[PDB]
Structure 1
Amino acid sequence: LQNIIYNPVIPYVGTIPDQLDPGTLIVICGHVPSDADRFQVDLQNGSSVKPRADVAFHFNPRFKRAGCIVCNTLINEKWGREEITYDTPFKREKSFEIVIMVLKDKFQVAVNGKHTLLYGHRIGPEKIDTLGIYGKVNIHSIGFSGPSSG
């Protein structure tokens, strides 16, 4: 991988190395803390806190009850329609590997080598230049792979 970040402190907010052109991969390896309630991975347009930066893609695994993954987009500080995935591969006290592939019309996400969900772009991905990770989660590494990697 390229531009790897190891054991980052959460909350984590860092500029992404390259434009997320179709085919780009975002690999995030971590572990879910005991009794974690939730955590999130946000692909943002900037790092402004106020006004809060738009979130092109909000990937938010929730663990209470049966557990799920909520995906949404924040525009001008307003959340849009939630897209919920009820078949979540995340579990407390277990490690994980998240692979987000940026396609032309959507994001494709796989966890632990298994397809998990799709999310159509609401904001042009070229507007994303910042990665944010918040919540109860331990991140081991963050890596990026461009479309022409090899």
Structure 2
Amino acid sequence: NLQNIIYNPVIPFVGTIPDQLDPGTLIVIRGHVPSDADRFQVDLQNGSSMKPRADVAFHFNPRFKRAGCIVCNTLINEKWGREEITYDTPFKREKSFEIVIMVLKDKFQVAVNGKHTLLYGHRIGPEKIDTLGIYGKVNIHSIGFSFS
């Protein structure tokens, strides 16, 4: 029902993904936003190079300034594509969360706490994702996977 569970990873976290992100796969991330968070991001990456920065197939970036939002994008050759902004964000400072990223054939479907949050169409074949990055101001209790 969940495997390869990592507990209380230090952030910034970079970790190799166990198996392939095929349709049906779930990535489950449970955590808590620190009272002073400005933003954090979950990146599904092709590799872990820092300079040059590895490509990010799916950058999921809750931001907490202003009214707060979530920005989703794809980084290729150190350049960002078209941003998809979601203004209805379930993330709050000092509040805990469960993020479920479901890999569908055509898109990612993201729900927080069991409620649908956003969709993001595949720009890179998800089969090429091999690394999970979590950066910014966030406390992660656990990361887990349920493949296929």
TM more than 0.5: yes
Q: Deviations over 1:73-129 (max 9, x none)?
A: 000000001000000000000000000000010000000110000000111101100
CA distance in 2, matches of 1:33, 1:50: 28
CA distance in 2, matches of 1:64, 1:54: 26
- Measure how far apart 1:65 and its partner are: 1.3
The secondary structure found in structure 2 opposite 1:19 is: coil
- Measure how far apart 1:69 and its partner are: 0.2
Q: Deviations over 1:38-92 (max 9, x none)?
A: 0000000000112110000000000111110000000000000100000000000
CA distance in 2, matches of 1:56, 1:89: 23
CA distance in 2, matches of 1:11, 1:80: 23
1:12 aligned onto 2:13: yes
Match of 1:44 in 2: 45
Q: Which runs of 5+ in 1 are unaligned?
A: none
CA distance in 2, matches of 1:123, 1:136: 27
Match of 1:35 in 2: 36
- Measure how far apart 1:35 and its partner are: 2.2
| Number of residue pairs the alignment of both structures matches | 146
The secondary structure found in structure 2 opposite 1:117 is: strand
For the aligned residues, what is the CA RMSD?
Answer: 0.9
CA distance in 1, matches of 2:122, 2:37: 28
The secondary structure found in structure 1 opposite 2:19 is: coil
Q: Which runs of 5+ in 2 are unaligned?
A: none
CA distance in 1, matches of 2:90, 2:51: 33
1:83 aligned onto 2:84: yes
CA distance in 2, matches of 1:84, 1:76: 22
CA distance in 2, matches of 1:127, 1:82: 21
TM-score normalised per structure 2: 0.97
